[PDB]
Scaffold this motif. Structure first.
Motif, PDB file in Angstrom:
ATOM      1  N   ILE A 102      44.359  32.832  63.208  1.00  0.00           N
ATOM      2  CA  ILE A 102      44.771  33.854  62.254  1.00  0.00           C
ATOM      3  C   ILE A 102      45.794  33.180  61.313  1.00  0.00           C
ATOM      4  O   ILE A 102      46.772  32.591  61.786  1.00  0.00           O
ATOM      5  N   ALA A 103      45.567  33.291  60.018  1.00  0.00           N
ATOM      6  CA  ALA A 103      46.535  32.849  59.023  1.00  0.00           C
ATOM      7  C   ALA A 103      47.391  34.041  58.560  1.00  0.00           C
ATOM      8  O   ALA A 103      46.874  35.145  58.319  1.00  0.00           O
ATOM      9  N   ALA A 104      48.698  33.831  58.445  1.00  0.00           N
ATOM     10  CA  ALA A 104      49.601  34.830  57.884  1.00  0.00           C
ATOM     11  C   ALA A 104      50.288  34.151  56.705  1.00  0.00           C
ATOM     12  O   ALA A 104      51.251  33.430  56.878  1.00  0.00           O
ATOM     13  N   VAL A 105      49.763  34.386  55.515  1.00  0.00           N
ATOM     14  CA  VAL A 105      50.203  33.656  54.323  1.00  0.00           C
ATOM     15  C   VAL A 105      51.367  34.444  53.712  1.00  0.00           C
ATOM     16  O   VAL A 105      51.169  35.486  53.066  1.00  0.00           O
ATOM     17  N   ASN A 108      49.731  23.841  47.941  1.00  0.00           N
ATOM     18  CA  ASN A 108      49.366  22.589  48.593  1.00  0.00           C
ATOM     19  C   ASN A 108      48.703  22.908  49.894  1.00  0.00           C
ATOM     20  O   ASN A 108      49.212  23.686  50.672  1.00  0.00           O
ATOM     21  N   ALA A 109      47.570  22.251  50.120  1.00  0.00           N
ATOM     22  CA  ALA A 109      46.730  22.458  51.295  1.00  0.00           C
ATOM     23  C   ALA A 109      46.422  23.951  51.562  1.00  0.00           C
ATOM     24  O   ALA A 109      46.394  24.380  52.696  1.00  0.00           O
ATOM     25  N   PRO A 110      46.108  24.711  50.536  1.00  0.00           N
ATOM     26  CA  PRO A 110      45.742  26.122  50.762  1.00  0.00           C
ATOM     27  C   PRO A 110      44.455  26.259  51.548  1.00  0.00           C
ATOM     28  O   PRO A 110      44.168  27.330  52.083  1.00  0.00           O
ATOM     29  N   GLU A 111      43.669  25.198  51.602  1.00  0.00           N
ATOM     30  CA  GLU A 111      42.433  25.245  52.358  1.00  0.00           C
ATOM     31  C   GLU A 111      42.695  25.452  53.848  1.00  0.00           C
ATOM     32  O   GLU A 111      41.897  26.085  54.513  1.00  0.00           O
ATOM     33  N   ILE A 112      43.862  25.008  54.352  1.00  0.00           N
ATOM     34  CA  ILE A 112      44.161  25.149  55.758  1.00  0.00           C
ATOM     35  C   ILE A 112      44.230  26.605  56.229  1.00  0.00           C
ATOM     36  O   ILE A 112      43.519  26.983  57.159  1.00  0.00           O
ATOM     37  N   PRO A 113      45.095  27.442  55.642  1.00  0.00           N
ATOM     38  CA  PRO A 113      45.062  28.871  56.002  1.00  0.00           C
ATOM     39  C   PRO A 113      43.705  29.552  55.775  1.00  0.00           C
ATOM     40  O   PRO A 113      43.290  30.358  56.625  1.00  0.00           O
ATOM     41  N   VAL A 114      43.013  29.218  54.688  1.00  0.00           N
ATOM     42  CA  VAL A 114      41.808  29.965  54.331  1.00  0.00           C
ATOM     43  C   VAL A 114      40.597  29.555  55.209  1.00  0.00           C
ATOM     44  O   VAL A 114      39.609  30.257  55.231  1.00  0.00           O
ATOM     45  N   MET A 115      40.742  28.453  55.973  1.00  0.00           N
ATOM     46  CA  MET A 115      39.775  28.077  57.028  1.00  0.00           C
ATOM     47  C   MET A 115      39.857  28.934  58.283  1.00  0.00           C
ATOM     48  O   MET A 115      39.008  28.858  59.139  1.00  0.00           O
ATOM     49  N   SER A 116      40.894  29.750  58.386  1.00  0.00           N
ATOM     50  CA  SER A 116      41.114  30.595  59.547  1.00  0.00           C
ATOM     51  C   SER A 116      40.015  31.671  59.702  1.00  0.00           C
ATOM     52  O   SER A 116      39.337  32.025  58.723  1.00  0.00           O
ATOM     53  N   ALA A 164      50.619  38.219  52.528  1.00  0.00           N
ATOM     54  CA  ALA A 164      51.652  39.060  51.971  1.00  0.00           C
ATOM     55  C   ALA A 164      51.268  39.408  50.535  1.00  0.00           C
ATOM     56  O   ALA A 164      50.549  38.662  49.871  1.00  0.00           O
ATOM     57  N   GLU A 165      51.814  40.504  50.031  1.00  0.00           N
ATOM     58  CA  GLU A 165      51.586  40.883  48.627  1.00  0.00           C
ATOM     59  C   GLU A 165      51.932  39.774  47.639  1.00  0.00           C
ATOM     60  O   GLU A 165      51.329  39.694  46.589  1.00  0.00           O
ATOM     61  N   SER A 166      52.931  38.958  47.993  1.00  0.00           N
ATOM     62  CA  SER A 166      53.399  37.867  47.148  1.00  0.00           C
ATOM     63  C   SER A 166      52.598  36.565  47.271  1.00  0.00           C
ATOM     64  O   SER A 166      52.847  35.615  46.547  1.00  0.00           O
ATOM     65  N   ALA A 167      51.671  36.497  48.204  1.00  0.00           N
ATOM     66  CA  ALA A 167      50.882  35.268  48.392  1.00  0.00           C
ATOM     67  C   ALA A 167      50.056  34.943  47.166  1.00  0.00           C
ATOM     68  O   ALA A 167      49.523  35.829  46.479  1.00  0.00           O
ATOM     69  N   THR A 168      49.934  33.657  46.889  1.00  0.00           N
ATOM     70  CA  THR A 168      49.033  33.178  45.861  1.00  0.00           C
ATOM     71  C   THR A 168      48.370  31.935  46.378  1.00  0.00           C
ATOM     72  O   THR A 168      48.889  31.279  47.275  1.00  0.00           O
ATOM     73  N   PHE A 169      47.250  31.575  45.772  1.00  0.00           N
ATOM     74  CA  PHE A 169      46.477  30.405  46.224  1.00  0.00           C
ATOM     75  C   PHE A 169      46.117  29.594  44.998  1.00  0.00           C
ATOM     76  O   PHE A 169      45.568  30.140  44.050  1.00  0.00           O
ATOM     77  N   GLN A 170      46.410  28.303  45.043  1.00  0.00           N
ATOM     78  CA  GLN A 170      46.046  27.401  43.973  1.00  0.00           C
ATOM     79  C   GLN A 170      45.867  25.983  44.525  1.00  0.00           C
ATOM     80  O   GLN A 170      46.619  25.539  45.402  1.00  0.00           O
ATOM     81  N   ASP A 171      44.868  25.268  44.031  1.00  0.00           N
ATOM     82  CA  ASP A 171      44.664  23.884  44.452  1.00  0.00           C
ATOM     83  C   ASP A 171      45.570  22.985  43.585  1.00  0.00           C
ATOM     84  O   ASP A 171      45.149  22.384  42.604  1.00  0.00           O
ATOM     85  N   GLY A 172      46.834  22.954  43.945  1.00  0.00           N
ATOM     86  CA  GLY A 172      47.846  22.392  43.056  1.00  0.00           C
ATOM     87  C   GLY A 172      47.778  20.893  42.783  1.00  0.00           C
ATOM     88  O   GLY A 172      47.869  20.494  41.640  1.00  0.00           O
TER      89      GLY A 172
END
Ligand SMILES: C[C@@H]1C(=O)C[C@@H](CC(O)O)C1(C)C
Ligand SMILES: C[C@@H]1C(=O)C[C@@H](CC(O)O)C1(C)C
Ligand SMILES: C[C@@H]1C(=O)C[C@@H](CC(O)O)C1(C)C
Ligand SMILES: [Ca+2]
Lengths: 249, 248, 248
Positions: free
Chosen positions: B109-112, B118-126, B132-140
């Motif tokens: 389970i990822a809790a972002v 950086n390395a957003p692929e790690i949580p999203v592989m869960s 959280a409402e404030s979470a964002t995802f970018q391949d920086g």
């Protein structure tokens, strides 16, 4: 040598089969009420999909249920889940159930008339998925009962919903309502209960009027990826599921 | 022979590891503040995921960050990106990082908790992705820095977002906010910051109570397609990425 | 050995080719009006994609149409659909059309200027898909004409829309408007007709400024899954389409 319709149409106590103008309507039921999921219903569907696949007079298939639910009740006591040799009968027929479905070489339309919490992967494998406003989808008898979703659920739901929605759906007991299933792309149309079957017939008739090979090969060319992933992953799932289930006792 | 939790729980400077009733909480951090992506953090996560996978007392894993971001800063100077032999150390550990993650045979389970660039692929592989409402995802640190997104980003984003969203995301610097990630199917639930961990725990506990083999095999049967595509494409991406980087 | 741009830029009667600063603009058309789909246009695109793939001076490709439609008219009489040997010419060039497209090793941007009902898979195979407000997508010349969608339509639409949306789209004559395509993830941006090409150029210029190998390898690492399924399934679909068509 294939069993013609007149021989298998009356063979299955949980499956009513009616055909008009080459359009085969398959209605799952328990004594004319909504289907209660059992070992019998499971195995009947496997044999029935074989008969349907091999009967060239089927031009298009409509899969539906009856009453308020498509299938939202199960009789776990109808299954023997305690030993490997009991599980092998389930594994063998569980492979046949989904592989025979995929071997049907005409378009399949689902008409989901209400909740489906047992074998929901069967209607959502269809080429066209129609849902009543009251339809819901949940993987009921696997992870909520402490059973691995290894029977093809693990193939179909990530395939149809996507990786993350599929895995989450299977692990958290999620129930999709009709409009959510539509948004996720599992369902193509949401209709009122009264509109549902008429719409299924409308689409089926239009498809049935298309040229013989165009209709059959449209189905064939469109099922390639699902067949590939099912062959890769189904048996693996079933064997792991059986192992985990036997550990319970 | 497996390293027990008492030994590895204290091994990793950027990874706090706490376990209660078989629920493992993995919190990435830099000195108790939000994680700053470095060579050390990258390699530690690879070693740590191996330890987690090999330890059968982990029943379920929660991956999270700390502070306002999950990981939204990088120190490029901590990496050596100039030569093939330096790149082979990154390729080798980069393979380990994602393969070791996939080798974990309990649900993840990822809790972002906030922005991840950086390395957003790690949580999203869960298996379950909570944001959280404030979470964002970018391949920086790939294409925006003129670096090929060949480290598994190229596998994960098209796999989870779909072909055209995935490629667009990687080529245009796109930043997904929490509700867009939810709409795209990368995130399963968007929660307030204060509800995020409570919800992760609630889900984890419920999973941890499932029968031993059911819980383990659920994970196994659900990661088949990701493991197939990762094996097919990861090393190819890493080698091309190294070549292009060295050309700089 | 490769045909430079100065030798293929004027080779094609249905494809205008213009390049500025390495950004290649490919405009499909019939005598300066919206493209009418023909055997000539189909085979030209196959040859043209080969020329583009082999020309290293192309840094980024924009594919577009002209006038009100991208391509929403077809001339079925331009094709020979009656016999196996005639179908082998279509199969051979149909393979080349999509395989040559995929062999292009720079990012491809589609700018869909209006309705596309013939070969809509071409623009949607792009890495970035931009659509005018008036763009629509429909698989026109296959199942509505009693022809199997076996020419790559069967690969691309389930790949980009998902299994159930893709199959339904191909079997029911569905027309996606621009905002539905956007919601389904086949389109990345919807723009006014006036904004469309300026936005394509803006993105293309930005990509073209990225380092040489990073730009080229970004495309290469991102087309893996599409290439895999196309090789698995394209020829199977074309041969079955041909058989069904000859049966007519
Ligand atoms: C409800 C289920 C099936 O119909 C057969 C068994 C295996 C399966 O399909 O998962 C079951 C768990 C009892
Ligand atoms: C941030 C990146 C990684 O952590 C290692 C390198 C390769 C990679 O993972 O893309 C990097 C570019 C420095
Ligand atoms: C419009 C179609 C193509 O361009 C070639 C033929 C085969 C195909 O499906 O691509 C066609 C049916 C005439
Ligand atoms: Ca969606």
């Amino acid at each position: 040598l294939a069993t013609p319709f007149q021989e298998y149409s009356q063979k299955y106590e949980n499956i009513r089969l009616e055909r008009d103008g080459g359009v085969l309507l398959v209605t799952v039921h328990t004594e004319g009420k909504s289907l209660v999921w059992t070992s019998t219903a499971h195995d009947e569907l496997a044999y029935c999909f074989h008969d349907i696949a091999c009967d060239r007079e089927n031009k298009v298939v409509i899969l539906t249920g009856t009453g308020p639910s498509f299938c939202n009740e199960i009789d776990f006591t109808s299954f023997n889940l305690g030993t490997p040799h009991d599980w092998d009968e389930i594994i063998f027929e569980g492979q046949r159930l989904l592989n025979n479905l995929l071997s049907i070489e005409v378009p399949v339309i689902a008409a989901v008339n209400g909740p489906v919490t047992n074998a929901p992967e069967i209607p959502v494998m269809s080429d066209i998925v129609l849902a009543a406003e009251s339809a819901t989808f949940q993987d009921g008898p696997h992870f909520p009962s402490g059973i691995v979703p290894g029977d093809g659920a693990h193939v179909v739901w990530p395939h149809v919903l996507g990786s993350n929605r599929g895995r989450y759906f299977l692990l958290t007991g999620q129930e999709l309502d009709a409009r959510t299933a539509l948004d996720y792309g599992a369902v193509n149309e949401v209709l009122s209960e009264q509109e549902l079957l008429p719409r299924a017939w409308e689409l089926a008739r239009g498809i049935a009027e298309k040229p013989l090979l165009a209709r059959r090969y449209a189905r064939k060319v469109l099922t390639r990826q699902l067949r590939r992933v099912m062959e890769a992953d189904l048996s693996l799932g079933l064997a792991h599921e059986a192992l985990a289930a036997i550990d319970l006792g």
